[PDB]
């Protein structure tokens, strides 16, 4: 009853992968060992979506694990929580893809993905109804971003049917780490915008603002920027693990919020988000949290959703809440801020409602916002290509991975096409 | 006999059918286990010795909300194979629950129906509880009821249907589901009942004083006007309505059977000790607008029929006198070809209310059911709605891609817009 | 007097006849040792003083399934004389069975089985139970058939078979087994009751709620299907059906003589509680397909006789009402050369049912036997399996070292063409 | 009633059969002294059909133990469970066969065979209905491949209607341990193709590819690889030995494995197979060993079932188990994999089921597939063969023991018919 199947590829996809197993096994009362602890019969009841029922009333993820360095592997297995995968999902090569797309999408990654096939196929089989695939990675090095995307295209061929959902961290120029980011980026978004139904854009720049401003954090870490991406993830996904007043699954979601099929890039955001200190001069009410949503400041892409206008946003919101406040709240959102809604899809707003809060709260939001400004986003990127392939420097290394410069031009090419649809939708 | 057999679709119809049933449990003194320590058949078969079983399908094509039933305080009420779940909902399209999702569990319902059927010896017909904007909601109810008009033919369908709203909308796509389930609506049901979640909530905060009414709240009103309705049929009193009664004094035009109901007094413990709350005052309080089901103003529309079913300590001298009363009110005004548009309804039993309900219990009730023009205004937003949308395409893929022709969405809306053009129609003096 | 002796061939054989007579010590309160702390003289000879002895004849080639018997709980109720073993099976060959292996056991049994019917004074006959497709079911059976028609003659033969199924099949040389069997069976059985197993798990699943369905669960539903056939002959009640009645009704010309059999209500515990089991009800389910003991579609066939047999707390008028019910629903076809095609049997004691078995107790029950064309389907698939293997002469070789001759192969499959046949002209209108 | 002797043949033969008779000693309950301390009934009701019953409660293996070394027969003497056996029933040479076929089947085996002859005949005395008999040994070397070929066509032709089966270790390029292996396969294969009624093809490589790739097994030795053999052989006469719900011996296996006299070879497989940290991550259940048994990893023969088609598959299940799940997997099996299963044989599976299950484990399955891939094995050898014999190197050695090259010729053209045969029914 429908199944999801999890892939982590990459050192970035394999670490937020980490953080949401955590977080979601504690949702479902599970502890590091697979077994359930749990208190409610509702914690089991859905349980089967994200997790396989193995002998001896133990839970094991249904996840793959894909990189092509083994470190990452060895962290993940000594991690909290790292012994309750199965270690026939682990799937690693021993090279390292050095930040190159080519050696991940058409080399290294070629040879490694057929494994990796075979895991996912046998985890298909294993699920009684498959609604689709979710896989977290990046964009900007070589394995999440080369080889995920040639993962992503077969899947899809295999399985054309089934929801198709990504969640992508997209390199920013602020927290620039690499050199070819700009490249891997571009190949991997053209490849993106075909196979995939649903991609969450989630900006490590504006994760660290999160941090910083709203959570009042003087040294955030990677773990601290995780966690974040794996609470939006677990709010997706609440529907279908819990019950509710009003349910929304991924393809509801996915039907209400994609008007055309390109445009399935989401902004999104998470509520509530306090720091220590200012947590006791608070409203735990629902007018706050989507207060706190709709800012521009609580999205997770480095985006002003005011330099724009949204398409749809869905808001899903967790805890024992009434309909009416959540109804009279979004519609006075949309009238007051009418100019940043556009005004050929009347009622841009879909909201759904889960009874299970989140633990540790009372009441939560996840808000998915899809907005004509996340062209900022590829615009930058787009201009960061050019500046290096107008002079074609370090191209020498992807051509030797059998790649041409053709590639590159299709790729520019298409990303700006897409920057174009958004632009003329937004008007 | 006069059975009524009960079909509640998708998330929507399966939370009202449930307020429903606590309801009619309440009403015969049927306990959650079937047990019961006469009338009550209508609603209720009987097995063997202390066990009694809704004459009622739930269905829906995901299994979240009838999951919620099994597990519940009612697991014993209902036989599990009347309890219809398949694995995957119609995600709000149309599309889906009418043809894709919906063609697989068709069939089964039909054929459990029919069983079901087969128990009853003076089937008076189906009550059906669905929304219209929800996936399921619409296409596989529409798909239902085509299948059902088929086999069952000349047998009454009414139908009582949530609406969309105005302003309060949940979903995006709500208008595109609503215009294609009215289209089937029109040719399959006798009668259909709309009613707006707006309209209720407004109610339930100015008429209970319930500062955040939520959807619990909104289905025990619900609840409420169909006990009103089949009243008549599980108890007895001075005047009775059967449900062919009511069509025929209800409907003027076979396509014009969308009555708007509205229930009086609904209020709340303290605020009715100090109203004097008399047949004549609730008669009136029935004409006003503020206490609608539906959003939309009946002072910009015109009356065509009544039905007034008023139940408990009332006898027919006052409603004569409060219908009179309405007689000379200048603001409620009928049309010319409508001398009489009363149907008088009374029922002794008073409405029984449920444990820890919003509304306080009172000596008498009355539910309304008129057909005014004015329900047409409703249909005009919504068309408008989804002529915006359709300008631009918007979303039409999904629906494409899943069997729908673009050319059923324009048909469709003619389809509406003659309706409309219809209701203007006998509106209008000669 | 009135017995029936029971001969139970092979593994199949042996198990089906296992249940049955855990099913029979149950019904007469007979206990495994065969102490009885009369009627049951139809199933069991009695010796001395506290002893009842099963009018049965057990047979294997190999000992292992009998070998069970023997060691377990009812040892001391069959004398040891009746369990009849082997050393070596007829490993899914028919020849081996008939020819090789058969012809060294044959005589034996056929002594035992006359010293056995030496004892009974008025003898009904014979229940034969054995798989078509093994080797042992197939070959012996058909072996054993033969000499029991040339010893005894006139006595009337009634064999149980699990047919093969379309697609849940066993063993690869099935079909081969299967088609040889079928040739003998036409001359030599006087009425041959197919069963299939994908059927009953399909019914186990569906009607009982059994997740993973045992073939002891299929063995105890095959012997309540017995039971209602024999206890006309072992209870009384207001209507009554011997043997000799029974076939006179059901078989219309002698190579016709396969009806199929359903068995009505098959509930479990918790679901049949809700459900109001009346007797209009139970008649209605047997002419469903889902219902069936058989793969195939009696939709698509047309009846030429039913047998219903009733037993428990059932009255002559409610079964003429449901007959007449049935009688006007469209889709339940009989041939033009039947005006009345109803035999009607009703037995006063309700079904017993067997400690731990997955169906509930149920007031009453009821059992019908019918020869429709549809069955006709079945052979047609067998056919064409047997078709497609001969075509290439695959495993041929095995059968030839055995004794047999090709020659016989092509003989069975025209032998089954020609019934087909019959069977297509019987079901066509004038 | 239905008793098997057991015939063991040079080295392998010989280890390989201690294993199998150690497992089966604990099977049905014997230890190293022959006496029964088992503890169900079961156990000792089929006891027969393996063991004789000596003089005051023990049990001795209907067991021939042959050699042309004695080190053999010492090494199986001193092993755990050496004591069991009948010290009448070691017949042994002093020589050896060298590695040659000619020594074996010609000269020294036909010096000593009368000896094994002599107590075969004995032991088929004894037993009061002997079904046949099962022979272990390799293709490779002189003993097991020439003595063990010779005595095989010596026991049919006294025993013309019993069942003739063989547990065949066939000599692999990848684990090539000889130089001459392609000459003693080609000779005995020929004589196997018209004496052996099942041929159980057993390859080293693809037992260590089992050790290494499913048992996660660091360092296999030959004892482990002997182990998987020996499950195997247990596994086919399971049904002989307990009672179960649906029985097939080995009559019954190759009536309905077998469709042409010719084509008796099998590639044996064996489920479940798991490593000791992997085996907490996994279900116990039908679906699941039905899903191990039909892949290719999990056959002990080094070929492709997916380079051929299925004749026939047997599988015989172990374990309390339902029928229905056990056909509805069968069927599910056939109806996926359509292409690999030959069309002119409808319902090419034959399941067996017997209620005990291994110790260890609460489900078990054997697997037995008819495939046209087999003639991969024999292709290579034979291509072997010719690259020696084109040249004649290494003749004079077989030459010298009284053979004529017109033998090999024959072998070989023997072979290649076989081998074309196959691949005429393959299509
Ligand atoms: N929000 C997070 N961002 C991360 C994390 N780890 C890395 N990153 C960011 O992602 C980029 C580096 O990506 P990766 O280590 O994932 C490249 P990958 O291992 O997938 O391929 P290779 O090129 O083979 O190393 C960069 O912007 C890092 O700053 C993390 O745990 N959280
Ligand atoms: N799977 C196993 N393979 C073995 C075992 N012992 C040997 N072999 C393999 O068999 C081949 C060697 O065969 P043998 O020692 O049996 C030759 P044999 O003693 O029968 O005759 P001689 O020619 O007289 O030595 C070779 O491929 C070995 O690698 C064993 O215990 N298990
Ligand atoms: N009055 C009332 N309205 C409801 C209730 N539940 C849902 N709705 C309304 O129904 C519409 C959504 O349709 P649903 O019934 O949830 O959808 P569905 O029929 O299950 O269709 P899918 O989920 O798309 O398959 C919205 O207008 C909701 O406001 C309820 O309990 N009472
Ligand atoms: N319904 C049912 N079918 C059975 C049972 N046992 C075996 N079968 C079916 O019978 C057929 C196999 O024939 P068996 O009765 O086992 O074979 P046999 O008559 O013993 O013949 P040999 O063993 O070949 O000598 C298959 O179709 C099995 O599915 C049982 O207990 N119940
Ligand atoms: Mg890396
Ligand atoms: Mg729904
Ligand atoms: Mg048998
Ligand atoms: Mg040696």
């Known amino acids: 009853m429908r199944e999801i199947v999890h892939i982590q590829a990459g050192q970035c996809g394999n670490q937020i992968g980490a953080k949401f197993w955590e977080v979601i096994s504690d949702e479902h009362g599970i502890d590091p060992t697979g077994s359930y602890h749990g208190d409610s019969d509702l914690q089991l009841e859905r349980i089967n979506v994200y997790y396989n029922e193995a002998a001896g009333n133990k839970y094991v993820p249904r996840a793959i694990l894909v990189d092509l360095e083994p470190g990452t592997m060895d962290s993940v297995r000594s991690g909290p929580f790292g012994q309750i995968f199965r270690p026939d999902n682990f799937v690693f090569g021993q090279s390292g893809a050095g930040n190159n797309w080519a050696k991940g999408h058409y080399t290294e990654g070629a040879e490694l993905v057929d494994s990796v096939l075979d895991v996912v196929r046998k985890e298909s089989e294993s699920c009684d109804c498959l609604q689709g695939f979710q896989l977290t990675h990046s964009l900007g090095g070589g394995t999440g971003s080369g080889m995920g995307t040639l993962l992503i295209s077969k899947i899809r061929e295999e399985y054309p049917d089934r929801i198709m959902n990504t969640f992508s961290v997209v390199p920013s120029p602020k927290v620039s780490d690499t050199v070819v980011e700009p490249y891997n980026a571009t190949l991997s978004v053209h490849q993106l915008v075909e196979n995939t139904d649903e991609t969450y854009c989630i900006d490590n720049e504006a994760l660290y603002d999160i941090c910083f401003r709203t959570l009042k954090l003087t040294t955030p870490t990677y773990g601290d920027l995780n966690h974040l991406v794996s609470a939006t993830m677990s709010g997706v996904t609440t529907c279908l693990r819990f019950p509710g007043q009003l349910n929304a699954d991924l393809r509801k979601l996915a039907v209400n919020m994609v008007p055309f099929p390109r445009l399935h890039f989401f902004m999104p955001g998470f509520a509530p988000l306090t720091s220590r200190g200012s947590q006791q001069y608070r409203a735990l009410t629902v007018p706050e949290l989507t207060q706190q949503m709709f800012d521009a400041k609580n999205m997770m892409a480095a985006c002003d959703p005011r330099h724009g206008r949204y398409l749809t946003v869905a808001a899903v919101f967790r805890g024992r809440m009434s309909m009416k406040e959540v109804d009279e709240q979004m519609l006075n959102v949309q009238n007051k801020n009418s100019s940043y809604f556009v005004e050929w899809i009347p009622n841009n707003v879909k909201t759904a409602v889960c009874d299970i809060p989140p633990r540790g709260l009372k009441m939560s939001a996840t808000f998915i916002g899809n907005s004509t400004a996340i062209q900022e986003l590829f615009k930058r990127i787009s201009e960061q290509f050019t500046a290096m392939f107008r002079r074609k420097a370090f191209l020498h290394w992807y051509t030797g991975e059998g790649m041409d410069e053709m590639e590159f031009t299709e790729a520019e090419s298409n990303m700006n096409d897409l920057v174009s649809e958004y632009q003329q939708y937004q008007d | ?430």
């Open chain 2, 1 to 430: 006999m006069r059975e009524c057999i009960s079909i509640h679709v998708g998330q929507a119809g399966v939370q009202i059918g449930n307020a429903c049933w606590e309801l009619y449990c309440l009403e015969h003194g049927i306990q959650p286990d079937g047990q019961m320590p006469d009338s009550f058949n209508t609603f209720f078969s009987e097995t063997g010795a202390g066990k009694h079983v809704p004459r009622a399908v739930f269905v829906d094509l995901e299994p979240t909300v009838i999951d919620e039933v099994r597990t519940g305080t009612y697991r014993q009420l209902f036989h599990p194979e009347q309890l219809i779940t398949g694995k995957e909902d119609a995600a709000n399209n149309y599309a889906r629950g009418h043809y894709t999702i919906g063609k697989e569990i068709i069939d089964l319902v039909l054929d459990r129906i029919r069983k079901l059927a087969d128990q009853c010896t003076g089937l008076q017909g189906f009550l059906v509880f669905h929304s219209f904007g929800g996936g399921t909601g619409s296409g596989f109810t529409s798909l239902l009821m085509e299948r059902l008009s088929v086999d069952y033919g000349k047998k009454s369908k009414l139908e009582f249907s949530i609406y969309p709203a105005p302003q309060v909308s949940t979903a995006v796509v709500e208008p595109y589901n609503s215009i294609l389930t009215t289209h089937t609506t029109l040719e399959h049901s006798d009668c259909a009942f709309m009613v707006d979640n707006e309209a209720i909530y407004d109610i339930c905060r100015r008429n209970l004083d319930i500062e955040r009414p939520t959807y619990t709240n909104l289905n025990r009103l619900i609840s409420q006007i169909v006990s009103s309705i089949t009243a008549s049929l599980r108890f007895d009193g001075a005047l009775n309505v059967d449900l062919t009664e009511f069509q025929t004094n209800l409907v003027p035009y076979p396509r014009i059977h969308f009555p708007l109901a509205t229930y009086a007094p609904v209020i709340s413990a303290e605020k009715a000790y100090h109203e004097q709350l008399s047949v004549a005052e609730i008669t009136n309080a029935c004409f006003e607008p503020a206490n609608q089901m539906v959003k939309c103003d009946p002072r910009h529309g015109k009356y065509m029929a009544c039905c007034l079913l008023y139940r408990g300590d009332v006898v027919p001298k006052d409603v004569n006198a409060a219908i009179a009363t309405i007689k000379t009110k200048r603001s409620i005004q009928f049309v010319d070809w409508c001398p009489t548009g009363f149907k008088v309804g009374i029922n002794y039993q008073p409405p029984t209310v449920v444990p820890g309900g919003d509304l306080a219990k009172v000596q008498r009730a009355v539910c309304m059911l008129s057909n005014t023009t004015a329900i047409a205004e409703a249909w005009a937003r919504l068309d408008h709605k989804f002529d915006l949308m359709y300008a631009k395409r918007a979303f039409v893929h999904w629906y494409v891609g899943e069997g729908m022709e673009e050319g059923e969405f324009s048909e469709a809306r003619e389809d509406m817009a003659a309706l409309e053009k219809d209701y203007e129609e006998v509106g209008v003096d000669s």
